[PDB]
Amino acid sequence: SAKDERAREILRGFKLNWMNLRDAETGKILWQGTEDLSVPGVEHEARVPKKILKCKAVSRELNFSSTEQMEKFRLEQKVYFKGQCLEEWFFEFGFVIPNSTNTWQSLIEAAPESQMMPASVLTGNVIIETKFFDDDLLVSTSRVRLFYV
């Protein structure tokens, strides 16, 4: 398919360079991944400090490079807990210049305290499924298992 070949071109040219999760109230980086978590067909793992569950909001800063242009780069992320979808997150970056490196910052706000899930319940049981799109074209689907430490 024309569309499959293009998706593959974009992916071959795409990578996540680094990513921070920063406490938006203190400024402190709590977690910094340097692995390319866009890579599909393998389960990635991430260990995050459990005190991230106490933040009122987190700044997620993602640095990525793309050889190909994208008209409307966006993400859909699902949070699966023991295979149940609990949450769905949507983020839009927009136009990506060909051969560019870009930092994308987004604020993820905590739910009310009474709805937050405990670390000991979550750890090892959460999968984040990320679909990377250019508008309606699915470029990659990646999976990351989270451990809260």
Binding site: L21, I108, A110, A111, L146
Partner: peptide, 5 residues
């Protein structure tokens, strides 16, 4: 918003 983040 999130119950895990």
């Amino acid at each position: 918003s999130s119950t895990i983040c």
